[PDB]
Design a protein around this motif. Structure first.
Motif, PDB file in Angstrom:
ATOM      1  N   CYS A 108       7.611 -19.142  38.255  1.00 41.97           N
ATOM      2  CA  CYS A 108       8.748 -20.042  38.200  1.00 41.97           C
ATOM      3  C   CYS A 108       9.517 -19.803  36.907  1.00 41.97           C
ATOM      4  O   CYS A 108       8.959 -19.280  35.940  1.00 41.97           O
ATOM      5  CB  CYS A 108       8.268 -21.495  38.273  1.00 41.97           C
ATOM      6  SG  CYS A 108       9.607 -22.722  38.392  1.00 41.97           S
ATOM      7  N   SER A 134      11.152 -21.137  33.671  1.00 43.90           N
ATOM      8  CA  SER A 134      11.110 -22.269  32.767  1.00 43.90           C
ATOM      9  C   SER A 134      12.007 -22.029  31.559  1.00 43.90           C
ATOM     10  O   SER A 134      12.200 -20.888  31.132  1.00 43.90           O
ATOM     11  CB  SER A 134       9.666 -22.514  32.319  1.00 43.90           C
ATOM     12  OG  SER A 134       9.071 -21.316  31.842  1.00 43.90           O
ATOM     13  N   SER A 187      12.448 -23.332  27.623  1.00 42.31           N
ATOM     14  CA  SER A 187      11.883 -24.095  26.520  1.00 42.31           C
ATOM     15  C   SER A 187      12.919 -24.245  25.414  1.00 42.31           C
ATOM     16  O   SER A 187      13.366 -23.258  24.828  1.00 42.31           O
ATOM     17  CB  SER A 187      10.618 -23.413  25.988  1.00 42.31           C
ATOM     18  OG  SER A 187       9.863 -24.289  25.162  1.00 42.31           O
ATOM     19  N   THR A 212      10.115 -27.899  27.568  1.00 36.10           N
ATOM     20  CA  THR A 212      10.143 -26.829  28.542  1.00 36.10           C
ATOM     21  C   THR A 212      10.441 -27.388  29.927  1.00 36.10           C
ATOM     22  O   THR A 212       9.581 -27.995  30.565  1.00 36.10           O
ATOM     23  CB  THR A 212       8.804 -26.069  28.568  1.00 36.10           C
ATOM     24  OG1 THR A 212       8.420 -25.712  27.232  1.00 36.10           O
ATOM     25  CG2 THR A 212       8.908 -24.810  29.422  1.00 36.10           C
ATOM     26  N   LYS A 213      11.663 -27.179  30.382  1.00 37.89           N
ATOM     27  CA  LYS A 213      12.119 -27.729  31.644  1.00 37.89           C
ATOM     28  C   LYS A 213      12.142 -26.649  32.714  1.00 37.89           C
ATOM     29  O   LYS A 213      12.066 -25.456  32.412  1.00 37.89           O
ATOM     30  CB  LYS A 213      13.520 -28.324  31.477  1.00 37.89           C
ATOM     31  CG  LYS A 213      13.588 -29.450  30.456  1.00 37.89           C
ATOM     32  CD  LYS A 213      14.988 -30.027  30.347  1.00 37.89           C
ATOM     33  CE  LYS A 213      15.394 -30.763  31.610  1.00 37.89           C
ATOM     34  NZ  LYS A 213      16.782 -31.289  31.527  1.00 37.89           N
ATOM     35  N   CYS A 214      12.240 -27.073  33.961  1.00 42.55           N
ATOM     36  CA  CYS A 214      12.323 -26.144  35.073  1.00 42.55           C
ATOM     37  C   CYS A 214      13.774 -25.760  35.332  1.00 42.55           C
ATOM     38  O   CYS A 214      14.615 -26.615  35.616  1.00 42.55           O
ATOM     39  CB  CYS A 214      11.713 -26.765  36.339  1.00 42.55           C
ATOM     40  SG  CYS A 214       9.967 -27.259  36.159  1.00 42.55           S
ATOM     41  N   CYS A 246       8.023 -26.372  41.398  1.00 43.20           N
ATOM     42  CA  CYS A 246       7.855 -26.394  39.955  1.00 43.20           C
ATOM     43  C   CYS A 246       7.899 -27.823  39.424  1.00 43.20           C
ATOM     44  O   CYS A 246       8.919 -28.507  39.519  1.00 43.20           O
ATOM     45  CB  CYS A 246       8.942 -25.544  39.296  1.00 43.20           C
ATOM     46  SG  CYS A 246       9.066 -23.858  39.982  1.00 43.20           S
ATOM     47  N   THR A 248       7.578 -30.295  36.189  1.00 50.42           N
ATOM     48  CA  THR A 248       7.669 -30.336  34.746  1.00 50.42           C
ATOM     49  C   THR A 248       6.652 -31.330  34.187  1.00 50.42           C
ATOM     50  O   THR A 248       6.729 -32.532  34.455  1.00 50.42           O
ATOM     51  CB  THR A 248       9.086 -30.728  34.299  1.00 50.42           C
ATOM     52  OG1 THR A 248      10.053 -30.059  35.119  1.00 50.42           O
ATOM     53  CG2 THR A 248       9.313 -30.346  32.850  1.00 50.42           C
ATOM     54  N   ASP A 294       8.863 -32.977  27.889  1.00 53.59           N
ATOM     55  CA  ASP A 294       8.507 -31.983  28.887  1.00 53.59           C
ATOM     56  C   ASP A 294       7.878 -30.786  28.193  1.00 53.59           C
ATOM     57  O   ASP A 294       8.542 -30.085  27.440  1.00 53.59           O
ATOM     58  CB  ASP A 294       9.737 -31.550  29.685  1.00 53.59           C
ATOM     59  CG  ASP A 294      10.343 -32.692  30.475  1.00 53.59           C
ATOM     60  OD1 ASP A 294      11.531 -33.010  30.256  1.00 53.59           O
ATOM     61  OD2 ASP A 294       9.634 -33.293  31.306  1.00 53.59           O
ATOM     62  N   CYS A 344       6.490 -26.166  32.686  1.00 51.54           N
ATOM     63  CA  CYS A 344       6.944 -26.195  34.065  1.00 51.54           C
ATOM     64  C   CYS A 344       5.966 -25.401  34.918  1.00 51.54           C
ATOM     65  O   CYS A 344       5.924 -24.172  34.849  1.00 51.54           O
ATOM     66  CB  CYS A 344       8.358 -25.612  34.179  1.00 51.54           C
ATOM     67  SG  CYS A 344       8.987 -25.504  35.885  1.00 51.54           S
TER      68      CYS A 344
END
Lengths: 118, 118
Positions: free
Chosen positions: B15, B17, B19, B56-58, B80, B82, B105, B108
């Motif tokens: 996935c 991600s 950050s 760190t998000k998706c 995914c 988070t 977060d 992900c």
């Protein structure tokens, strides 16, 4: 037996990670490359807080003997990499407690490669 | 064209991600469920440190229209998620700056499900 709702209709990941809140971390490397002594509790002046660190390590570098679960290990080579991040902690390089940024394991990611070198 | 060594013979994940080190976080929820005002810089007494948060998000909840890349989306359903963690930050619930643990977060993760309800 069908007596398993996939744990919680999910939750399982491509790789098995273990997240632990470590307080017994006695040493960590600051972002500047300084190996410092980490305190379980932050002693500023007259305030003591139990900080702890969420270290997410890889339980397995390869959950399956090919790469990660579900991954087509024929086209994709996979392995679990533990990502390191720098966290603001009160640490002492010797006899001086100071707020520094020390590398902890934040996550365990499954990386994919086309297993084709160039 | 074969002019691509898989970025760095890897690095790509199941996935995507992102950050980010966020300092402009003005609000966050403490572990006790307290929505608090987050400070970009920690003002203790006579010491100011730029703390920032690694969020760190998706980038995508589903990199592919089925689940995650490489995953057999026929037997495994993927998405995914988070992951949220509580980080020791100096935050003010109103007019009192105090060290609390606020949800950010941290990662992900691609979760796998057998897409079979029970």
């Amino acid at each position: 037996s069908s007596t398993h709702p996939v744990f919680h209709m999910g939750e399982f990941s491509v790789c098995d990670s273990v997240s632990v809140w470590v307080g017994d971390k006695t040493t960590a490397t600051d972002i500047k490359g300084k190996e410092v002594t980490v305190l379980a509790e932050v002693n500023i002046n007259n305030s003591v807080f139990r900080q702890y660190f969420f270290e997410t390590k890889c339980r397995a570098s390869n959950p399956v003997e090919s790469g990660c679960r579900g991954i087509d290990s024929k086209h994709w080579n996979s392995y679990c990499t533990t990502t390191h991040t720098f966290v603001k902690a009160l640490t002492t390089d010797e006899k001086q407690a100071a707020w520094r940024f020390i590398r902890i394991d934040t996550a365990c990611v499954c990386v994919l490669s086309r297993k084709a070198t160039r």
